Amino acid sequence: ALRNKAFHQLRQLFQQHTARWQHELPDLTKPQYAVMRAIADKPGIEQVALIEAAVSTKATLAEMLARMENRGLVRREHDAADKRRRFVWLTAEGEKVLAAAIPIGDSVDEEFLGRLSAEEQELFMQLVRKMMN
Template structure:
């Protein structure tokens, strides 16, 4: 073992801990959500589209913090499943407007209660004060400009 690395404790590094927490959350999501083809990122995309209404990809990308290329793939997969409607913007032919299809709205509404349970299960090891603190710290870290 390299003597220079003895003072670097992996279990004390924020990136490592965030990744481990996200892995745990993802495992809970996959276990609790009835639709085994719906990922947490796809769900977040559908929630954002529901909140925005019909919106261009750039607006959805901003709302979800998902890069444009990745979002295009997510939208394509959800559209292929019949969960999204994608149309050309009549005002700007370069843009595509995305909305939930009736099937997408139905799946989203059916999934939201389980998604709430996922949040509760993810936060289960924390007491009430720790939950508030954790969410506030994560919001601050997530929303701070790089």
Template sequence: MSDLETLPGHLIRRLQQIAVALFSTRMGEADIDLTAVQFAALMTLRDHPGLDQQTLAGMIAYDRVTLGGVIDRLEQKDLVVRETSPTDRRARILNLTEEGRQTLDRAIPWVDRVQEEILAGLSDEEQAMFMTLLSKLTRAGNELSRAPLRGR
């Protein structure tokens, strides 16, 4: 039987738990009602306005069906609006509202702080190496995911 502390999958899951806890704590301190996935959706819509839900799901590596609930909640909070595509009446495109932009602007410094806290146990050199290796691993395993990352 393996020692859990030697299993990469276990340690990655633990780091994810830590990251989510930090994110939730910091958003609570800032009085911002956002989850990490909602933040990712808002950031991507800010950078790529007018995406459809399927494309957005691919760009943040999230299951398309589950993302529907995320978008529903963002729409209820008046952070995102769904509109009929001008080129395909069957498609719905997503855009940030002004409230969505303001919320995102308020959240970014707090999210930056979370990133610093996640990496705080590493030296600057170790942080750079960790990020390089983490990026390499996620790219290498992308197609193994239930929701692979897809470009636009």
């Protein structure tokens, strides 16, 4: 049975959280939200540096930022030397969207993390880290 595979059950949890995220924030996906968190944490960050926050490829991040910039969420400036390298900022409207979404995303995470104690949450984090490093 697929219920006995750890990574199948992982996709069940990931899609349950994504479905709840899409219901509460239909206009801000998790990769879009995480990218905005990184821009607000480091204004003027290099566009390529947002790959880690996006957990995506260069093309997916380029398409994501182009749509975000078209929706008035982010603004970008090019390098005078290499006009392909870009620096990303949050627009004033983008900071309002991000500020309103942070408690919504936290409560969506709390719907699942709340079923775990503090020790179980930190232990879930350590298990996921060991599987990647």
